[PDB]
Design an enzyme around this catalytic site. Structure first.
Site, mmCIF file in Angstrom:
data_model
loop_
_atom_site.group_PDB
_atom_site.id
_atom_site.type_symbol
_atom_site.label_atom_id
_atom_site.label_comp_id
_atom_site.label_asym_id
_atom_site.label_seq_id
_atom_site.Cartn_x
_atom_site.Cartn_y
_atom_site.Cartn_z
ATOM 1 N N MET B 12 38.218 55.198 72.070
ATOM 2 C CA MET B 12 39.775 55.703 72.021
ATOM 3 C C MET B 12 39.981 55.091 70.788
ATOM 4 S SD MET B 12 43.173 54.832 74.266
ATOM 5 C CE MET B 12 43.393 53.403 73.743
ATOM 6 N N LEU B 28 47.936 59.935 70.239
ATOM 7 C CA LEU B 28 47.662 59.924 71.635
ATOM 8 C C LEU B 28 48.666 61.040 72.308
ATOM 9 C CD1 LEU B 28 46.903 56.831 73.750
ATOM 10 C CD2 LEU B 28 48.388 58.292 74.634
ATOM 11 N N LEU B 34 44.417 65.085 77.090
ATOM 12 C CA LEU B 34 44.794 63.949 77.592
ATOM 13 C C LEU B 34 46.220 64.126 78.455
ATOM 14 C CD1 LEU B 34 44.373 60.724 77.872
ATOM 15 C CD2 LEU B 34 45.928 60.461 75.985
ATOM 16 N N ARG B 100 39.175 58.028 68.672
ATOM 17 C CA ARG B 100 40.191 58.998 69.042
ATOM 18 C C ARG B 100 41.354 59.146 68.194
ATOM 19 N NH1 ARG B 100 41.349 63.530 69.321
ATOM 20 N NH2 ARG B 100 41.454 64.972 71.101
ATOM 21 N N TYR B 101 42.181 57.982 68.467
ATOM 22 C CA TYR B 101 43.463 57.819 67.878
ATOM 23 C C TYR B 101 43.812 56.932 66.636
ATOM 24 C CZ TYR B 101 43.603 59.892 72.468
ATOM 25 O OH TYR B 101 43.673 60.780 73.684
ATOM 26 N N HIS B 199 40.298 50.364 83.866
ATOM 27 C CA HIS B 199 41.627 51.137 83.733
ATOM 28 C C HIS B 199 41.709 52.317 85.039
ATOM 29 C CE1 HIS B 199 44.593 52.656 80.494
ATOM 30 N NE2 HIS B 199 44.645 53.488 81.598
ATOM 31 N N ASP B 276 36.713 43.451 73.859
ATOM 32 C CA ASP B 276 37.941 42.982 74.305
ATOM 33 C C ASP B 276 38.859 43.906 73.579
ATOM 34 O OD1 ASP B 276 37.948 40.575 75.858
ATOM 35 O OD2 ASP B 276 37.070 39.589 74.062
ATOM 36 N N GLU B 279 43.580 45.636 76.997
ATOM 37 C CA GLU B 279 43.322 45.469 78.453
ATOM 38 C C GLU B 279 42.877 44.100 79.025
ATOM 39 O OE1 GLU B 279 40.866 48.510 80.293
ATOM 40 O OE2 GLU B 279 41.596 50.168 79.200
ATOM 41 N N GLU B 283 46.944 42.476 78.926
ATOM 42 C CA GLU B 283 47.105 42.482 80.458
ATOM 43 C C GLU B 283 46.389 41.517 81.536
ATOM 44 O OE1 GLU B 283 46.391 46.947 81.518
ATOM 45 O OE2 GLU B 283 46.909 46.442 83.538
HETATM 46 C C1 LIG Z 1 54.465 55.840 80.016
HETATM 47 C C2 LIG Z 1 55.074 57.092 79.053
HETATM 48 C C3 LIG Z 1 56.492 57.033 78.923
HETATM 49 C C4 LIG Z 1 56.884 56.697 77.394
HETATM 50 C C5 LIG Z 1 58.235 56.247 77.390
HETATM 51 O O1 LIG Z 1 59.101 57.500 77.118
HETATM 52 O O2 LIG Z 1 58.817 55.235 77.454
HETATM 53 C C6 LIG Z 1 54.746 58.481 79.876
HETATM 54 C C7 LIG Z 1 55.315 59.760 79.012
HETATM 55 C C8 LIG Z 1 54.285 60.871 79.055
HETATM 56 C C9 LIG Z 1 53.331 60.436 80.342
HETATM 57 C C10 LIG Z 1 52.110 61.317 80.766
HETATM 58 C C11 LIG Z 1 52.278 62.718 80.875
HETATM 59 O O3 LIG Z 1 53.457 63.024 81.923
HETATM 60 C C12 LIG Z 1 50.972 63.434 81.113
HETATM 61 C C13 LIG Z 1 50.420 62.975 82.465
HETATM 62 C C14 LIG Z 1 50.880 63.486 83.826
HETATM 63 C C15 LIG Z 1 50.451 62.940 84.935
HETATM 64 O O4 LIG Z 1 50.848 63.249 86.229
HETATM 65 C C16 LIG Z 1 50.035 61.143 84.963
HETATM 66 C C17 LIG Z 1 49.493 60.826 83.669
HETATM 67 C C18 LIG Z 1 50.195 61.486 82.321
HETATM 68 C C19 LIG Z 1 48.931 61.112 81.188
HETATM 69 C C20 LIG Z 1 51.432 60.651 82.053
HETATM 70 C C21 LIG Z 1 51.512 59.098 81.840
HETATM 71 C C22 LIG Z 1 52.781 58.416 81.807
HETATM 72 O O5 LIG Z 1 53.588 58.928 82.603
HETATM 73 C C23 LIG Z 1 53.204 58.817 80.128
HETATM 74 C C24 LIG Z 1 52.316 58.456 79.070
HETATM 75 C C1 LIG Z 2 46.848 58.418 82.017
HETATM 76 C C2 LIG Z 2 45.851 58.440 80.882
HETATM 77 C C3 LIG Z 2 44.323 58.918 81.298
HETATM 78 C C4 LIG Z 2 44.431 60.045 82.515
HETATM 79 C C5 LIG Z 2 44.857 61.166 81.881
HETATM 80 O O1 LIG Z 2 44.076 61.798 80.788
HETATM 81 O O2 LIG Z 2 45.956 61.603 82.250
HETATM 82 C C6 LIG Z 2 45.845 57.025 79.854
HETATM 83 C C7 LIG Z 2 44.726 57.411 78.752
HETATM 84 C C8 LIG Z 2 45.425 56.559 77.437
HETATM 85 C C9 LIG Z 2 46.604 55.798 77.845
HETATM 86 C C10 LIG Z 2 47.663 55.306 76.955
HETATM 87 C C11 LIG Z 2 47.128 54.239 75.908
HETATM 88 O O3 LIG Z 2 46.291 53.288 76.455
HETATM 89 C C12 LIG Z 2 48.124 53.890 74.924
HETATM 90 C C13 LIG Z 2 49.348 53.178 75.749
HETATM 91 C C14 LIG Z 2 49.127 51.574 76.327
HETATM 92 C C15 LIG Z 2 50.339 51.052 76.974
HETATM 93 O O4 LIG Z 2 49.951 49.760 77.283
HETATM 94 C C16 LIG Z 2 50.699 52.051 78.036
HETATM 95 C C17 LIG Z 2 51.197 53.399 77.392
HETATM 96 C C18 LIG Z 2 49.987 54.150 76.838
HETATM 97 C C19 LIG Z 2 50.749 54.999 75.999
HETATM 98 C C20 LIG Z 2 48.919 54.583 77.755
HETATM 99 C C21 LIG Z 2 49.387 55.549 78.941
HETATM 100 C C22 LIG Z 2 48.274 56.112 79.824
HETATM 101 O O5 LIG Z 2 47.544 54.604 80.381
HETATM 102 C C23 LIG Z 2 47.162 56.876 79.165
HETATM 103 C C24 LIG Z 2 47.839 58.097 78.402
#
Ligand SMILES: C[C@H](CCC(=O)O)[C@H]1CC[C@H]2[C@@H]3[C@H](O)C[C@@H]4C[C@H](O)CC[C@]4(C)[C@H]3C[C@H](O)[C@]12C
Ligand SMILES: C[C@H](CCC(=O)O)[C@H]1CC[C@H]2[C@@H]3[C@H](O)C[C@@H]4C[C@H](O)CC[C@]4(C)[C@H]3C[C@H](O)[C@]12C
Ligand SMILES: C[C@H](CCC(=O)O)[C@H]1CC[C@H]2[C@@H]3[C@H](O)C[C@@H]4C[C@H](O)CC[C@]4(C)[C@H]3C[C@H](O)[C@]12C
Ligand SMILES: C[C@H](CCC(=O)O)[C@H]1CC[C@H]2[C@@H]3[C@H](O)C[C@@H]4C[C@H](O)CC[C@]4(C)[C@H]3C[C@H](O)[C@]12C
Ligand SMILES: C[C@H](CCC(=O)O)[C@H]1CC[C@H]2[C@@H]3[C@H](O)C[C@@H]4C[C@H](O)CC[C@]4(C)[C@H]3C[C@H](O)[C@]12C
Ligand SMILES: C[C@H](CCC(=O)O)[C@H]1CC[C@H]2[C@@H]3[C@H](O)C[C@@H]4C[C@H](O)CC[C@]4(C)[C@H]3C[C@H](O)[C@]12C
Ligand code: FES
Ligand code: FES
Ligand SMILES: [Cl-]
Ligand SMILES: [Cl-]
Ligand SMILES: [Cl-]
Ligand SMILES: [Cl-]
Ligand SMILES: [Cl-]
Ligand SMILES: [Cl-]
Lengths: 359, 359
Positions: B12, B28, B34, B100-101, B199, B276, B279, B283
């Site tokens: 990633m 991302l 995703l 990826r990003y 994770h 590292d 995470e 975290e």
């Molecule tokens: C944590 C972040 C909020 C950013 C913010 O506005 O502060 C939110 C915004 C979009 C969200 C994602 C999107 O709703 C897409 C996914 C929906 C699934 O039900 C959970 C994972 C999922 C991958 C979500 C993870 C997390 O709740 C996200 C990444």
């Molecule tokens: C929920 C998703 C994995 C499963 C899925 O694809 O829905 C994971 C993959 C990448 C993750 C994101 C990335 O690690 C980048 C951000 C890291 C921050 O600490 C939290 C928000 C953050 C924006 C993460 C939200 C969420 O944990 C993600 C969006």
């Protein structure tokens, strides 16, 4: 000569006949570890009465009852025969059945083992993968028995609380998978998708730290390594009930999902139990394989034979007990660690009961 | 001489400097494989702009950026050196980083690989356990690239899409765990509780059939077997975000739960990543081990060293590529099975991209 070593085979059990259904459910609903219900002493008897018809009907559909005791008994007999030859020093071995919710109950078994004046008792859970809801419940019953009877054990106790990757268990699974693959049309053998299915757990249980999911997963990996990844697979979960969230994918939705996506040749593999019971004969064979699979348009869906009377499985059991005896272990290292979010006071008492045993 | 075999190391990635955080988040929030958001092309820019400050702060707390590229580069160099001696036939080997990003992007790497006129390209995911959200997303990007560039590959493609139980990967984890156990006060070594942390995934992803949980679980078991169950453990999950349900138990709650229950000597083991990154450095090390930890009064909490520059890990990478090449595999058998409840059209095209490769 009188038995010296008693092997207590623990399992939840299932009603042997339709008449045993009600009391089976009653003991279940009264189990505080498993459930917390308001005025439980009045609701349990009630819920039992209300759910009996539906559950009796399920058992009627598979012949009129659970075969768990028959298979457990057969496995136990074969195990003992081997043990007497494997470990002569541990004199005559005798197996006892300790069902959690049906006769013979765990308590009734412990009583008999004590009456037989055994030198040592081994709590041998029949669930290869540990769940606080299964093996944990059975072990709590042993601790609670002595605590409730206000007497200390007259036998040396120890437990084989888990065995998710036992090499012989893995071979049995692999063998049954292979022979079932032979039953598919030859032109579709390589197309066959393997769905390992295990009884699910409410997420509330998984999220507290239950060891089950991870161990079941371990068993699956071991089996596939032995099969040399001949076919693709997925580990899914069955038996969810209620409106609450449980660990998925659900086995039924997965079967339907696969079919709708062109994977119409499926091999179901019960991976968390060693004998036929309601989960295989009714849920997998009837509701999923005959009804669901039918309405979704599968081409071939089969279920690997449960271990049941396979002689190699009896050998696995005897090997586990024998190795347990030779190692002098009182329990697995894993049992010495309760769930990170465990809120049940007995759990710690139960583990201590075993880790503190004399010898 | 010009490179013959290219090894694309997929991950990633993470922002190298605080200034890279914004575009990291933007890419991302735009990834369909995703997430699916309404008017995504509109929301992504905004959400990225919102979260940047807080995420920049997290990276500042660990030194100002992610060390992923540094470690990936080092592991890649070591891998190549070994490969040139292990597989002379596949001439000079060259590693390429496909983040990826962040730069270098998967797309930029593919462009350079094509440009270098390689005879063969290997998509080597750096995630040992397959998730459609990690490795799957990376593989989709390869397929999408060519489909979008309106051109077919000029080099032979294949992928090492997963390697959860590779014996040398397992040895590295075990080695790092053992040396970390040595750092605990001797009187508490056997009291140490091991928390494997990976994770987490939203339950909506787990419930669709994601292979990840089961594979991570397999890695855990192999490691513990190699450690001969010297200490008790639990597999827990970190990095949950949002209000939706994720696979638990949560690493933070587990640390706190254990401490409140008297288990104050904990060893954290990142089990789903090889170097590292945020995470581990933020975290686990900062919010969990420094803040949370003392909040409940832990006696000793340590984290096994990430694989990073371990020479043995470089060997693991090289042996995986070597075996992959010699076996002539195009992908794992597992990749030929999409999630039972997969609703992403690209998944199937991506797998076909690999299963249909010439050779
Ligand atoms: C944590 C972040 C909020 C950013 C913010 O506005 O502060 C939110 C915004 C979009 C969200 C994602 C999107 O709703 C897409 C996914 C929906 C699934 O039900 C959970 C994972 C999922 C991958 C979500 C993870 C997390 O709740 C996200 C990444
Ligand atoms: C929920 C998703 C994995 C499963 C899925 O694809 O829905 C994971 C993959 C990448 C993750 C994101 C990335 O690690 C980048 C951000 C890291 C921050 O600490 C939290 C928000 C953050 C924006 C993460 C939200 C969420 O944990 C993600 C969006
Ligand atoms: C409130 C409690 C949930 C507690 C929990 O989270 O474990 C639930 C679990 C079992 C439920 C009961 C059982 O489903 C049996 C009955 C079903 C009827 O439809 C309503 C009353 C009825 C008597 C239920 C009342 C209430 O919904 C109960 C008692
Ligand atoms: C959910 C629980 C396991 C996790 C836990 O301890 O909460 C399992 C263990 C025993 C299960 C019960 C028993 O198998 C008996 C019944 C079987 C029926 O097919 C469904 C209801 C039924 C009453 C089950 C409800 C639920 O699946 C139980 C209660
Ligand atoms: C299926 C059975 C009866 C429902 C009915 O006919 O009314 C109900 C009654 C008590 C229920 C159980 C109790 O509410 C205790 C647990 C509550 C958790 O949220 C789910 C599992 C859990 C273990 C429940 C499984 C299932 O919903 C039970 C076993
Ligand atoms: C409705 C949709 C869920 C998609 C789905 O998984 O079904 C969710 C996922 C991402 C969410 C958005 C992101 O979390 C970003 C914003 C967060 C703000 O607190 C509310 C609006 C906000 C703009 C959210 C609106 C809505 O809750 C979204 C769009
Ligand atoms: S609920 Fe698992 S140890 Fe108590
Ligand atoms: S989401 Fe897993 S194969 Fe598509
Ligand atoms: Cl049954
Ligand atoms: Cl153990
Ligand atoms: Cl504990
Ligand atoms: Cl990072
Ligand atoms: Cl595979
Ligand atoms: Cl598929």
């Amino acid at each position: 000569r009188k038995p010296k070593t008693g092997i207590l085979m623990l399992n939840m059990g299932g009603p042997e006949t339709l008449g045993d259904v009600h009391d089976f459910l009653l003991r279940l609903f009264l189990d505080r570890d498993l459930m917390t219900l308001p005025i439980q002493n009045k609701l349990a008897p009630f819920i039992a009465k209300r759910r009996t018809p539906k559950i009796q009907e399920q058992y009627r559909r598979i012949g009129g009852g659970s075969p768990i005791k028959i298979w457990t008994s057969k496995q136990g007999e074969g195990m003992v025969k081997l043990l007497d030859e494997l470990s002569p020093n541990t004199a005559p071995h005798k197996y006892y059945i300790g069902f959690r919710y049906v006769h013979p109950l765990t308590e009734e078994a412990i009583e008999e083992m004590e009456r037989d004046g055994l030198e040592r008792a081994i709590a041998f859970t029949q669930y290869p993968q540990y769940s606080c809801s299964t093996t944990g419940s059975s072990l709590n019953a042993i601790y609670r028995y002595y605590n409730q009877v206000g007497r200390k054990p007259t036998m040396k106790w120890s437990t084989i609380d888990r065995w998710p990757t036992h090499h012989l268990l893995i071979q049995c699974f692999a063998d049954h998978i292979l022979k079932e693959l032979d039953h598919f049309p030859l032109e579709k053998r390589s197309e066959v998708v393997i769905l390992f299915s295990a009884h699910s757990l409410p997420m509330s249980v998984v999220n507290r730290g239950d060891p089950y999911p991870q161990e079941v997963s371990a068993t699956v990996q071991k089996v596939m390594e032995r099969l040399e990844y001949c076919n693709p697979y997925r580990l899914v979960w069955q038996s969810k009930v209620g409106p609450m969230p449980w660990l998925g994918p659900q086995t039924d939705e997965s079967i339907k999902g696969l079919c709708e996506r062109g994977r119409k040749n499926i091999l179901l593999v019960p991976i968390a139990f060693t004998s036929d019971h309601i989960e295989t004969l009714y849920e997998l064979d009837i509701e999923y394989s005959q009804v669901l699979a039918k309405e979704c348009g599968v081409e071939n869906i089969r279920r690997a034979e449960s271990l049941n009377g396979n002689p190699l499985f009896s050998k696995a059991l005897a090997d586990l007990v024998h190795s347990h005896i030779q190692s002098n272990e009182l329990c697995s290292k894993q049992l010495t660690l309760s769930c990170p979010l465990c809120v049940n006071p007995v759990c710690r008492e139960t583990k201590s009961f075993f880790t503190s045993q004399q010898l």
